[PDB]
Amino acid sequence: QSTRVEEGSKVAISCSLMADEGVHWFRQGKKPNPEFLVYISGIGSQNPAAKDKYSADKSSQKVTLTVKDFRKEDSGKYYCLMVKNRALTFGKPQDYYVEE
Amino acid sequence: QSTRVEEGSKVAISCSLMADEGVHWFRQGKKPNPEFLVYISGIGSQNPAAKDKYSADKSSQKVTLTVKDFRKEDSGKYYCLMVKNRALTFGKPQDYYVEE
């Protein structure tokens, strides 16, 4: 089911949402608790600002999360979501792993 | 890993967050796309309002999602989350399933 990625490569993860407002990224890895990664605003600014590991970029209402230097601890199911009208909408989740 | 639940029973799902603002619930089932369930506001009002299947209730900053008449299509990993300061915080996920 999950896609094997070469250790140390750069993985560009697509969000299928029409990103007209801000988009949150999180992942569910092997560890029990999910991890918030980054948020990118409607105008394209990311929080936290640092782009050395997780770089969220937006063009024409399409947001892409680039996970740089993909390692075993980055393996998991990646989710993008938008909060609108007291509800959540999700992109298609994407699953990536480094062989252990 | 997941907890087997008796078909048709009522499952009260705990959210470990200190729920001082509103809490969203969603689940990841066998189907690829996650499903938004319900949101409960800081003051305790749920959207959508209907409580016949998913009833989110709050007391003393603790939110509990009750899944009534638990069936095979309700099996999955249940998440609660809060959106604060351009980021997401998650409760401990909880996993429930009906034997198939």
Author numbering:
A (entry chain A), B (entry chain A): 5 to 104
Question: What text does the study give?
Answer:
The structure of recombinant ScCD8α extracellular region was solved at a resolution of 1.35 Å with a space group of C121 and further refined to a Rwork/Rfree factor of 0.198/0.2. The structure is composed of two molecules arranged in the asymmetric unit. Despite low sequence homology with known CD8α molecules, ScCD8αα retains typical IgSF V architecture. Like its counterparts in higher vertebrates, the ScCD8α dimer consists of 2 anti-parallel β sheets containing 10 β strands, labeled as A, A’, B, C, C’, D, E, F, G, G’. Notably, the A strand is in the back β sheet, lying parallel to strand G’, an arrangement seen only in grass carp CD8α thus far. Two cysteines (Cys19 and Cys84) form a disulphide bond linking the front and back sheet of ScCD8α and stabilizing the IgSF V architecture. The ScCD8αα interface contains four inter-chain hydrogen bonds, which are formed by Gln32 (chain A) and Tyr83 (chain B), Asn51 (chain A) and Arg90 (chain B), Gln32 (chain B) and Tyr83 (chain A), Asn51 (chain B) and Arg90 (chain A), respectively. Five aromatic residues including Phe30 (strand B), Phe40 and Tyr43 (strand C), Tyr83 (strand F) and Phe94 (strand G) are located in the center of ScCD8αα dimer, forming a hydrophobic core with a BSA of 315.51 Å2 and contributing to 58.2% of the total hydrophobic force. The structure of ScCD8αα shows a canonical cavity is formed between the CDR loops of the two monomers. Structure alignment showed that His28ScCD8α is placed approximately 1.2Å away from the surface, which may explain the formation of the cavity.
The CD8 molecule is a type I membrane glycoprotein with two isoforms, CD8α and CD8β, which can form homodimeric (CD8αα) or heterodimeric (CD8αβ) complexes. To ensure efficient T cell activation, CD8 acts as a co-receptor to stabilize the interaction of TCR with MHC I on the surface of antigen-presenting cells (APCs). In this study, CD8α and CD8β orthologues (termed ScCD8α and ScCD8β) were identified in small-spotted catshark (Scyliorhinus canicula).
